[PDB]
């Protein structure tokens, strides 16, 4: 149901061999060629994912995957979307000039996925499920930023990592939450600034923001282009004895989250409710 794909890459390897590797006998096929002129193109920017293929044994594939291919159709595609990066060949593995470590690190630091494939046998097909699974397991994904600092940010999840997470950058994915089967991803503060070393104006991809507050926070700073870049969108500040001047006053930023907060063995309420009814708040909006 609702499945249309696209496959991009250099003329070295574009989308071809997967036609002969389809061997069909969901997730229709191919395309990326013929069609025309921003008709089927930005319609393909309406449906799910796209595949970035590069022949490993030659570098210019990867080089102009970085400088040429990504930025055009990256910001063109919808918020969920994004791309899967795939090295080709790799059955040979000998003449291979690209270690997948640098590739995958560039990818996950572009927040984009990564895989390599032998399309001669096995692993090729073994990619498709690893796509469709996420497509079938998750109906809708949302991307959101967590800004803040110090202790309280250190406190507030899926229990992943620890107050020592993975050094200076990572992303955190959380399973589960009306039979939606959707998904959401939370992101480090400095990581937002880190991937616009790669892609700026990626603030289109974040449908929601989250802020944390401790006994001393001015918080007039992280909100510069937390204001300017996302603009209207959706927003929340969640941070028992709260301090309500700031609640009434310090949101001129408007947004939801009246300064919700919890600390207790009851802290379930906090993360659960906050991440949930906000999602239901986002979904109905839509509007392109
Ligand atoms: N070494 C290697 N080459 C492959 C494999 N699968 C497809 N090809 C090559 O792909 C070429 C044609 O399509 P391709 O270059 O990948 O895409 P195109 O540039 O858009 O035509 C053929 O010359 C094949 O040799 C593979 O598993 N290993």
From TrEMBL:
It catalyses: GTP + H2O = GDP + phosphate + H(+). One of its GO terms (molecular function) is GTP binding. Pfam families: Ras. GDP binds at residues 14, 16. PROSITE patterns: RAB, RAS. Disulfide bonds join 21-124. Its EC number is 3.6.5.2. InterPro entries: P-loop_NTPase (IPR027417), Ras-related_GTPase (IPR051065), Small_GTP-bd (IPR005225), Small_GTPase (IPR001806). It is an enzyme of class 3 (hydrolase). GTP binds at residues 16-17, 119. The keyword Nucleotidyltransferase does not apply. The keyword Amino-acid biosynthesis does not apply. SUPFAM superfamilies: P-loop containing nucleoside triphosphate hydrolases. Keywords: GTP-binding, Hydrolase, Metal-binding, Nucleotide-binding. Mg(2+) binds at residue 16. Belongs to the small GTPase superfamily. Ras family. Belongs to the small GTPase superfamily. Rho family. PANTHER family: RAS-LIKE FAMILY MEMBER 11. NCBIfam families: small_GTP. This is small monomeric GTPase. It comes from Entamoeba histolytica. The gene is EhRabX3.
